[PDB]
Amino acid sequence: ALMAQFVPPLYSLVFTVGLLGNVVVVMILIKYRRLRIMTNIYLLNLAISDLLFLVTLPFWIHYVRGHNWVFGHGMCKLLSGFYHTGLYSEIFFIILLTIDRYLAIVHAVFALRARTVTFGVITSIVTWGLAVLAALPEFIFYETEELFEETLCSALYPEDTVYSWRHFHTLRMTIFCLVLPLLVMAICYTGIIKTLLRCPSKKKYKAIRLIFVAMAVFFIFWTPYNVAILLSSYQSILFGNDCERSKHLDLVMLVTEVIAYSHCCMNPVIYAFVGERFRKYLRHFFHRHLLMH
Amino acid sequence: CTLSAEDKAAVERSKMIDRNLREDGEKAAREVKLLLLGAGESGKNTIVKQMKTGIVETHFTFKDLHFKMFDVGAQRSERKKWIHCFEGVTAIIFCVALSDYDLMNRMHASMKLFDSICNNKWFTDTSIILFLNKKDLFEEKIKKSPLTICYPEYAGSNTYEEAAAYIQCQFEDLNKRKDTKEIYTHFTCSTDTKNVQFVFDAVTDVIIKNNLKDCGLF
Amino acid sequence: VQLVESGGGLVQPGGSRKLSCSASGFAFSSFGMHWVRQAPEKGLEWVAYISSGSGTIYYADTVKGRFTISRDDPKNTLFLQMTSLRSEDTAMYYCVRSIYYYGSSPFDFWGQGTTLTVSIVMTQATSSVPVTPGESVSISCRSSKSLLHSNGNTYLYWFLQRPGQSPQLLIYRMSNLASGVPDRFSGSGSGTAFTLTISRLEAEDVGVYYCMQHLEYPLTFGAGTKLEL
Amino acid sequence: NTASIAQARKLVEQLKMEANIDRIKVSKAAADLMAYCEAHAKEDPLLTPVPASENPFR
Amino acid sequence: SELDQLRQEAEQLKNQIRDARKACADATLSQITNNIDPVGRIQMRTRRTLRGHLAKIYAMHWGTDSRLLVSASQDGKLIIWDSYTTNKVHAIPLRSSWVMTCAYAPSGNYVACGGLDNICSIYNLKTREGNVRVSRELAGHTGYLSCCRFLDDNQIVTSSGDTTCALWDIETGQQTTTFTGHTGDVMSLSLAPDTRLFVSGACDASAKLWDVREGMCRQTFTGHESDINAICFFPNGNAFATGSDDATCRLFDLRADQELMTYSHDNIICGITSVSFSKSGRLLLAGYDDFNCNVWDALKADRAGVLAGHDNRVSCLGVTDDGMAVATGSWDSFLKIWN
């Protein structure tokens, strides 16, 4: 049966851990670093994007429990658009962070003269604008659909005329999420790895391990979502027309959607917690809190 | 605030001074600062000339990177009570003359000084660039006097490639914090015009390490 | 420190003129500038002010829009774009330096000025006061508002304009002796009634004494009292 | 060397010059210090708090 | 010749001095002060947080006007701060970025600074050109400068690491008097309010009182286990308190020629960097390497209060001439004003 076998307790843990991570990351970054570095400002922007996504998450949990869309001032327009806005801003911000790491590790001499606060702010504003414009198609729902008393958000366009949004809903949702990010990340990471392998130090291997871990986590937790959404859109028609296979594919889609939303929680960890600077600053803040507490 | 007296031009001047201070600080941070040590016991002057009454500052630009070096040759004061003031230098250039092994020998004094500065807590995270100046003189001298005069425990051939390697390894062995501190040892000579490249590579590696820490990879 | 102005001469009403001033041995970049008129009636008036770096610009209601004060730090020159001249605009123009910080003495130097010909209220009880060498003279002035700001400064400035010479500063913000002047000059006040006194008059103390407030723009200048030997 | 002898002679002269100087007992100095501290205890803004009216640093 | 006799004479002079000092030590200051009421808890708040420096703060001085203060940082620039409005008055770009001490002239016309450059940089704040320029360079020292102070007669007493303290005449730029006797490096000076006498501290764990005119060390104090870091005079000028890296401060009285009281705590092992007195002298304020400033009762040493409004070493400390507020600088590039 549809609308059954749902586990909204799963979203609660990811939501709370995402709070505990992103809030702390933003607080430490703003309080101490004063946002004076390009990498720090990109990390802060990623933290705010993740915070927005995970603060928009709970309403989906409430709907899953059974609270239909009788809520007021929580219009389906902004709510639906915010999911895509956050999911695109996070990808763009990871891409920018990888580019910044590449520039700083292969072009450190030029990176010194290139990593300016004004340039970082300009790039962040441009990326925010691009993400917002990217999510404009998902902002436009034009209504919230009602069939029975259980109200639900309508799709981007009515299914009776779905042929007018072929490319945007088929390919652009995956090229900007799977192909371009992976290509850029690999093209950078190969250069960083090759440049770091020449350093005469022992701890350089830790950087290699962390880079590989980040790449593996991103791949493992974003490829399944992109492939499932692709398969569930067309493969469910060509071959997955069977009821049993359709139900299994729907369950897999739900599982991959749950897994992907957890990526926002590991982003602050993998990008800030690693590195002695963050533990130093966090310990200083903890000692300060104990002194005041 | 906007409720102050008519003398808001003072606040305007304060803001302008703050802007100038920020610009000067950005310029200073962009520049690379190096510490030079070994005066009075090594061919530091030769290295300074290649790069070209208290502290002496030398300015030179290489490969679009601005280099700023400080000479503390005025070592006639308690080092421990003013060395801490240099906490933040990108790297430390320590000069040793290989000919001092035979001339307690001066080489032992240089080793003790290196241990004192290498193990200093103020320079825990600052890399040290070691230049073995006057390599040709030591090469000529080794053929006449064995290295055992300075290192009785040494055992091996008297060939240059052996003695130089042994002493180079010996100097690094005094590092008690190898995990977080790296040593870049090079051989320097009066006719060696590429010594600037070694310093450039060392500072590039230091900047790369700093960027790695900033990005969280270190 | 020397300030020289240029660009005077006759001009038809409704025309335009670009007055200019140049300085040498003068930190023009860190110094502010003021423009003050001196009409044939000997009544000084304030024209415009430009702060360091052109951050803030102010004009009097009588010269708004028609005047555009501009500065060029590399050239160490100050400019005024004058348009729509009238008969009343005929007056000598002075460029005055000014610096604002604790312990400062603004308006400490006045330029020679240039002549252009077109084809809070301050009052002084005495228009003129006869005096003789070696005599003690006391002069007082009144203001339409209490100048004793909460900061503890009376914001009272005194100037002397000897015949044929530019005004010279005497006091700055509280009875405080200016630099380069003898110690015989002193002043006092209560917030609305201000007084200036000289212990022993000399031949060089002959001229017109001027009072100006600095509590709020526009800077209003006093009528002035002439001292006669 | 003569330098050491000269240094020793200068040290001896300085020590003998210092020894000739004598002053009041410890008790008198302590009493004077206590009296001065008590006398000016009222004028210290840090020893006792200050009302906010007479222009502190807000 | 007679080096043995000279050394024996020196040893028995030391014995005589020790005997004379011990003879007058009838009682300690602790016994006399037992009847004095405690100062209580001394709590201060960070009224101002001066910012603008981008490097470590090493020295600062309070002007005689009780408002303007000057701070020296490693950026190579001196900033004069209006404590009443957290406002910057002037910015002085220095030729050398390695400064270690700065002072504000009582007259307010000149400000002095120095450091590893071994050269005194005297800047004229009040000039007709507006910009701040160097007036005289008091070169001649063979070591790093550690402390400079302005005498009421417009003269500078210079402390340097070459074991020499000099009195410089500004208009001639020459050493009017040379002071020697310290075996260790000199770190801090302090002149008395009357400017008649002043004391100098050195790394030899001894404090020497030098009369600016006679060219002689009137008295010498010793007993510390490590180097001296800072010395300040009691408002009277008859006693001074000196800090040391051994984490202990002690009070010495000129008219007693003996230690009066020692300040120490079991929980405190960090050394002292700067020491200053309140106007009344009841409260002794000294900076510590533990990233905090401690307030000690000069009469009983009860540790009345502590200040922790800093994130790094507290390098400089100075009480206002009128005692209205206390400025605490640190290597965190921030200056905190307390009251």
Residue numbers in the entry:
A (entry chain R): 31 to 297, 330 to 355
B (entry chain A): 9 to 58, 437 to 438, 590 to 640, 648 to 762
C (entry chain S): 2 to 120, 150 to 259
D (entry chain G): 9 to 62, 72 to 75
E (entry chain B): 8 to 346
Please quote the authors directly.
Chemokine receptors are a family of G-protein-coupled receptors with key roles in leukocyte migration and inflammatory responses. Here, we present cryo-electron microscopy structures of two human CC chemokine receptor–G-protein complexes: CCR2 bound to its endogenous ligand CCL2, and CCR3 in the apo state. Extensive hydrophobic and polar interactions are present between both two chemokine receptors and the Gα-protein, contributing to the constitutive activity of these receptors. Notably, complemented with functional experiments, the interactions around intracellular loop 2 of the receptors are found to be conserved and play a more critical role in G-protein activation than those around intracellular loop 3.
C–C chemokine receptor type 3 (CCR3) also belongs to the CC chemokine receptor family. The activation of CCR3 is associated with chemotaxis of eosinophils, thus considered as a well-established target for allergic diseases, such as asthma. A single-point mutation (I2446.40A) of CCR3 was introduced to increase the constitutive activity of the receptor (superscripts indicate the Ballesteros–Weinstein numbering scheme). However, CCL11 was absent from the orthosteric pocket of CCR3, and the structure of the apo CCR3–Gi complex was determined with an overall resolution of 3.1 Å. In agreement with that, C32NTA substitution significantly impaired the activation of the receptor. By contrast, the EM map of apo CCR3 showed no density at the N-terminus, suggesting that the interactions with chemokines contributed to stabilizing the N-terminal region of the receptors. Despite of the absence of ligand, the conformation of apo CCR3 was similar to that of CCR2 activated by CCL2, except that the extracellular TM5 of CCR3 moved outward towards TM6 by ~3.6 Å (with W5.34 as a reference). The intracellular end of TM6 of CCR3 was rotated inward by 2.5 Å (with A6.33 as a reference) compared with that of CCR2. R3.50 of the DRY motif in both CCL2-bound CCR2 and apo CCR3 formed a hydrogen bond with Y5.58 instead, a conserved residue among all chemokine receptors, sustaining the active state. Alanine substitutions in the residues around ICL2 (R1313.50, L142ICL2, and R143ICL2) were observed to reduce the constitutive activity of CCR3.
